[model samples]
Target: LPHRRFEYKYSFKGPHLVQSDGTVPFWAHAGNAIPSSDQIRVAPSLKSQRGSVWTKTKAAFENWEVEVTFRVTGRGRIGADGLAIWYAENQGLEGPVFGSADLWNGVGIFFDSFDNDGKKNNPAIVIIGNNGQIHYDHQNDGASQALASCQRDFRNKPYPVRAKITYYQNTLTVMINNGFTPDKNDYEFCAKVENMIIPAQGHFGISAATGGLADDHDVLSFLTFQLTEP
Candidate 1:
C-alpha cells in the first residue's frame, strides 16, 4: 500500500526580493559579496547570517517523504560554490564551506564542482555527516557514505535534479535523480535519530557560499514539498 500523505502546512518568512524579471532573493547576510544583478539569491548568503523561516504547526511524521527541485546556473566562471538543503536542529544559517569538505555545522550535502585545495579533478557529490564528518563519491562512480546518489555532467550542460528523503522506523533513505531521469540507484547509511531532530515545526531553505574566485548560483524554482505523516 502507498504510504499515507500527511497534511503538513508550510509558510514563507523573510522578505524575498522577487523582481519582475522572474528573480527571487530569499535571504542574504552581511560581509560576503552580493550578486551583481538580481539574478540569484538564497538564505545565509553572507558571513554571520543566521535566521530561519518555520511553520507554526509542529507535526511529526514517520515513513514520510520530502522532496525539492533546483536549477543550478553558473556565473560563467569556475570555482563557484553551490547550495545545500538542510534538516537541522538549530536555526542558524552561518555555516561556511572551508577545506575540501568542512562546513561549519549541519550536514552539507554539497553539489560542489570547485576544488578548494588545488584538487580540481575531485568533483563529486559530497555530504557532511550529522556528526560533522565528510562523505563523498565520484558522480556515478559508486556510493560511499552519501545517503543517496545524483549524477550530472557538470561540464557541458545544466540539468534538473530531484532529491527525495524517506524516513521509516530508524532508517532513512535519500534518493537522487538528475535531469529527472532515475537510474543508477545509489544509497548510503544515515545517522540513526533516537528522536527526530528536525523540528515537527521548523524551517527549510537553500544555502550558498562562494570562494575567493568570482561566481554565482541561484534556485530557479522550488517546485513543491510533500511531507507525510505516520
Candidate 2:
C-alpha cells in the first residue's frame, strides 16, 4: 500500500457527469445520465445501444486499482442486460460495440445480466483482453470469449454492487461484492489473469445496451488509485 499514486473520484452530484458536447475531458453520452439526487443513471432508457461514457485524460499507469460502486435497477423483472467497464487505446467513439467498440484494444471487465441461449448462468461476470483483432461479436453478446468468468446473479440480488479491479505487471484481477459482503468483508474474484497486454497509457469508461428489457445502470462512485511501474 505504499508507492507513487494517481486517483479519479467520481461523485456524480452535478447535473451532468461530463458535458455531451465533446468539449470536456470526461463526459457521458446518450440522452440519459441526468444527475438527479446525486446519482447519474448511465442508462435511463430500455432501448438498444443507448449507453456510453469516456475519459479524454489519456491516463498513463502500468499498475492501478479501480474501485467502482454501481447499481442496476428498473421496471423489468428479468433486467435488460449488463454493463461493461474497460480501458482502451481508442480516442473514444459512439460505435456498434459493447458500449465501447466492436474492435477494441485493451482490457474489459463485463458484468452481463442476460444469457444468450438458455444458459445456466444468466448473470455472468467475465474478463477479456483484445489485441485489436478479436472483434466484439454483439450478435453473440460476447458469450464466446473471455479469459475467465464467474456466474453470479447481479440482477435479482441487490442494488449498489461494488467491483475492485487491480492491474499490476500485466496481471489483472476482478473482485465483486454485493449486499452479502460489506466493505469490511472480503471480496471474491470474479475473474483474474496475467496475459492481458495493455499499454502503459489509455482511457477508461463504462458502456451498456438495452433490448427488450431494461435497467437503470448507475455509477455512484469511481475511485482509481495508481501505482508505480514495475
Candidate 3:
C-alpha cells in the first residue's frame, strides 16, 4: 500500500479496531473507566495508569511518513498528562514498559504536560529508550520546544495537535504542529536510534496517562500514511 488512512469509531462492544494492509489496529482500554462510545469521554482518572490505547502495524516501513491529529477537551488545575506515538519491539498494554518513555522496548515521541515545580512550564517531546532513559536532544524545553532548539510547546492550550514522523534510511525527522506553525526537531537523531529502529519494521500507536490532573483526548482524525521509498 502506498498512502492509506483508516478511521475508527468509538465503541463499547469491544475495542475500536482499525485495520490497514495486513496490520490489525486495536485500541486497548487501559483506563480505570473504559472509554465511552463518544470520543469526548476518553479521559483518564487518578487510578488510571494508561488512559489511551494503540494498534500495531503488520508491516514496518524502512522509509515512511506517519501523521496523527489529536486534541484535549478540558483543562484542570494540574495540567493533563499527554499522549504518545511509539515505535517499539514489544506489544505490552499497560504502565511504563521500562520507565519514562519506554514504549515496549523502543523509542517514543511524547506529548507531555507542562507544570514547573516553581519555575517555568512547557510541553515536551522526549526520546526514551527501551531501558527507560532520556536522550539529550529529546528533552523538553522550559516553556515550549518552539522557544528552544529541539522542542516545541502548545502554549498550554486545549487545541488540536499534529505530529509527523519521516524515516529515511537511518535518518528520522519529527515535526510537531498545534494546527499552526511546524516545530521541526530531529527526534530520531537526538536518541541516536535511527539504526536501531530503521533496520526493521516496528509496532506503532498512541498511549496516554493520568496524574493528579485529568484531561480527555480526542482523535478527531488521522491521515493515511504515504511511503517515499528509498
Candidate 4:
C-alpha cells in the first residue's frame, strides 16, 4: 500500500490524459488549453492567444524530476512567443511572461521562439529563478536575468521534442532530446545551475503564448517523479 501510494503521488502520464467527466485527475487547466485523450493543445496557431495547464496540488517532495514531450509548429518562416515549464508557488494564471504571471516565486524554464533582441538566437532554452522580485525582460529575452541558457532550435521538428528538468538538492539541470532519434530516452544535457534555492510546495505548470506570429504549441505528455538522495 505504501509503494502504491508513493507511485500514485509521484507520477502521471497520457494517451489517457483527461477524464470523460470533464475533469483532469491531479491537474487543472485554463484559458485556451484544450485537453484531449492524447495531447493537450496549450495554444493553437493564432495570434494573441495564450493558455495554461497546471497541477492542482503542490509538490510534496523537495527534490524531483519532470519530463515533458511537446511539439511546436507553424506555417510561415517565423513564430512569435513560446512555452514555459514552471514550478511555482502559485497555480496557473494568465499574464505577460509567456502566458504566465510575472514576479514569480520559483523557477521557470522557457522555450523561447522569438528573437526579441535580434541576436538570431530564437528557439533558445532559458532558466529563470525568482523569489517574487524579478520581472522578465522581453526586449532582451530575459538574458540578463537568466540563471542558465542554451541556444537550441526546437521548432518544426519531425518528432516531438522531449525535455527533462531535474531539481535535486541545490542543483537544477536540464536535458533535451534532438527530436530526430527514435529512442525513447535519448537526452543530452542542456544546462545546469547550482546552489539555487527554490521554495517548497510549488505547483507544476505549463504555459504558452502567441503574438502577431503564431504556432501550435502542444504538450503530448508530462511525467513527474520524486527523487531520493544519492
Candidate 5:
C-alpha cells in the first residue's frame, strides 16, 4: 500500500473564502475569487480578467482523480472562454489564456466554450500535458496542439456541470456531464489517452477567465482522492 495520500474537499458553502475548513487551504491567485453560500465564483461574466485557486498543500498523487462541478452562465450567442483544471509545478502564472500563464509546467484540461473553429456550436474540452516547451494558442483555442480533444458544447448547461478526471496505470480519462439539468444519467467519456508520462506529483488547481465575450465561470465543488487500485 502507499505510505500516504494527498486529498482535499471543498464545497464552498460557508463564510470562508479561502477554506471551508477555516484554515486557508487554497490560494486565490488572480481576479475575483468570491466564495458564497453554495459556490465559488472564480471569475464573473465580465471582460478581460483572470482568476485562479490552488491548494496550499502540494499534492503528490501517483494515481488519483480530480472531480469538479461547475457552471458557465451568461447572456449571449457565445462566451469568451472557459476554465481549466490543472495539476502542475510552480503553481502557475496569471495570463490571457485560460486564466493561467503561458509556457506552464504540467497538465491542463481545458473546458473551452467559445467557437474558435467557427462551427457555431462546437465548444470543446482539450487535454494538454505540457512539457514546458509549448504555450497555449488562445486565438485557435489549443486546437492545433492538444494531446487529446472532444467536441461538446457545455455552455450554459442548466447548472452545476461536471468534469471528472481519472488517472491510473499511465492512463488518463475525462468524463463530463453537460446535460440540460443536474442529473446522474449523463456522465459520458469526453476523452482518453494511455501510456502518456504521468504528470509530476504537484498541486491541484482550478483556473478561469473571460475576455470581450464573457460568462460566469463558477466552480461549485472540488474533491480529490488517490486511486486505490494498483
Candidate 6:
C-alpha cells in the first residue's frame, strides 16, 4: 500500500490565507501586484503595467500539478496584452514576456488576450518552452514557437476560469475549465506536450502585463500538489 499522503507544497484559496503581518508565507509579489482578501491582482486596468507573484522557495518534486483559478477582465471595449503562468528556473524578474523575463529555462503558459496579428485569435492560450535563447514571438502571439496550444475565450467570464497544469514523467499536460457551466469539476483538455524537459526544481509564478489597452488580471486561487510514485 505504498501511499503515504497526498501532499501539497503551496495552497492559496485566497489572499486572506496570510500571516498576521499580511504576508502570504513562501510567496512574494512585485511590480504593482496587489494581494487582497479575495484575489491576487497582478495587474489592474491600467496601461503599461506589469506585475508578478512567485513562490519564494523552489519546487521540491519533479512531478507535480498546479490548479489555478484566475480572472482577466477589463472595463474597456478591448483589452490588450495578457496573463502568464510560469515554471522557470529563475523567478521574480520582470521583462517583456507577459510580465516575466524572456529566454527562460522552462515553460510559459500564456493567455494572450489580444489579436496582435489580426487573425481574430484573441484570447488564445499558448504554451512555449525555452532553453534560454528563444524570444517570444509577440508579433504572432507566440504561435510559431508554441509547443502546444489551444484557442479559448476565457476573459471576462462571470466566474473565474480554472487551469490544471500537470508535469509528470517528462510530459506536460494542461486542462481548463471555462467557468461557464454550473458543474464544479468540468475540466476540458486544452493541450499536452510529450518529452518536455524542464528544471527538476523550478519556481511557479503568475504574472500579467498591460499594453496600450489594459485588463484586471487576478488570481483567485492557486494549489500546488506533489505527485509521488506508489
For all predictions, the C-alpha RMSD in Å is: 7.6, 3.3, 7.3, 2.9, 3.2, 2.2
- Cα lDDT tens digits for candidate 6, 1-230: 22233344556766375556766667888897878887888998898999988888888677888889988898764686889999998794688888888889899999999889888877898889998999988888988899989998888887789998888778899999998976668999999999888987789988999988999998988888876667
Question: How would you order the candidates by TM-score, starting with the best?
Answer: 4, 6, 5, 2, 3, 1
lDDT accuracy of residue 32 in candidate 2: 42
Best-fitting candidate, scored by TM-score: 4
Q: Taking the candidates one at a time, how many backbone clashes does each contain?
A: 0, 0, 5, 0, 0, 0
Q: Write the per-residue lDDT of candidate 1 for residues 145-165, one digit (tens) a residue.
A: 454434332321345455555
Q: In candidate 1, residue 163 scores what lDDT? A: 54
* Candidate 6 stretches greater than 4 Å from native: 1-9, 18-20
Clashing pairs in 2: none
Candidate 6 Cα lDDT to native: 0.84
In what order do the candidates fall by lDDT, top score first?
A: 4, 6, 5, 2, 3, 1
66, model 3: CA deviation in Å?
A: 1.5
Estimate the TM-score for candidate 4.
Answer: 0.94
Tell me how far candidate 2 lies from the true structure as C-alpha RMSD in angstroms.
Answer: 3.3
Better of 1 and 3 by TM-score: 3
Model 1 residue pairs with clashes: none
How high is the lDDT of residue 10 in model 3?
A: 13
lDDT of 3 by residue, 1-230 (tens): 34433323211121332333322234443443234332423344443345445443333555555666566544544455666666665544565421123324555666655443333443555544453333323233222322112345543344556666555556555666654433333123222235545326455556666655656655543343536543
lDDT: worst 10-residue window of model 3 = 5-14
lDDT (C-alpha, whole model) for all candidates: 0.41, 0.68, 0.46, 0.85, 0.75, 0.84
Q: Indicate the worst ten consecutive residues by lDDT in candidate 1.
A: 47-56
Instruction: Identify the leading candidate in terms of lDDT.
Output: 4
